Write a protein that binds this ligand. Structure first.
Ligand SMILES: O=S([O-])[O-]
Lengths: 127, 127
């Protein structure tokens, strides 16, 4: 949806992502190293793949105040994975993620999802 | 969907939900204290609210083979929140989550989602 490949090492891509997100009000709350946890649990050897859970507290608080169960679809995931041409960054589109909800609830959340999507697409565009 | 209210405290509910998930092959990879992070960032007191990222490594590994970009949807969120009549546990239903995905990936993903959902609803039933 929002996808970009960077010619950058993993650590470089990850620092540039954290920095572009922080410019737009999104902090990183969680991180899962998917290759390291598949190794530890299953003995599998997979290429680099991280999932970062990023969040703007103001937009999150607003969404959770309107619809408390919306925590099931937070935070916004950012994937960084090894690609041929370097590291691919993928960012969850909030508008797309709210489509699991009834249409009336998506209307009720639209201003927040739009604001989040605009800040996220801005971060991506600066990578 | 998938919710139960526990006549219990938040730490009784957390110790308990983690035990019931473990029984069903789901471990907790991440956790966000929503009330403490919104207080920290925004200065507002909010009611107890936790987001636990639960994962079964074998099911996640197969999901990632069907669709490499499914890391944007993982792991499976479990909410514990102060509710009206106790602490409400909500579990993201894998079947609903996958609906956001391209039509083309749905059939291949259906049996991993069915297996996840049966394990989760089992864990929820034992609380
Ligand atoms: O960071 S403030 O702009 O939500």
């Amino acid at each position: 949806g929002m996808r970009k490949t960077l010619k950058a090492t993993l650590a470089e891509a990850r620092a540039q992502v954290e920095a572009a997100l922080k410019e737009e009000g999104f902090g990183i709350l969680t991180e899962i190293d998917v290759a390291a946890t598949l190794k530890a649990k299953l003995g599998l050897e997979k290429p680099p793949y991280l999932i970062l859970g990023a969040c703007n507290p103001n937009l999150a608080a607003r969404a959770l105040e309107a619809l408390p169960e919306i925590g099931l679809l937070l935070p916004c995931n950012v994937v960084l994975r090894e690609a041929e041409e370097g590291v691919e960054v993928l960012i969850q589109d909030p508008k797309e993620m709210f489509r699991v909800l009834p249409e009336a609830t998506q209307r009720a959340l639209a201003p927040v999802a739009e604001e989040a999507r605009t800040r996220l697409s801005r971060a991506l565009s600066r990578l």
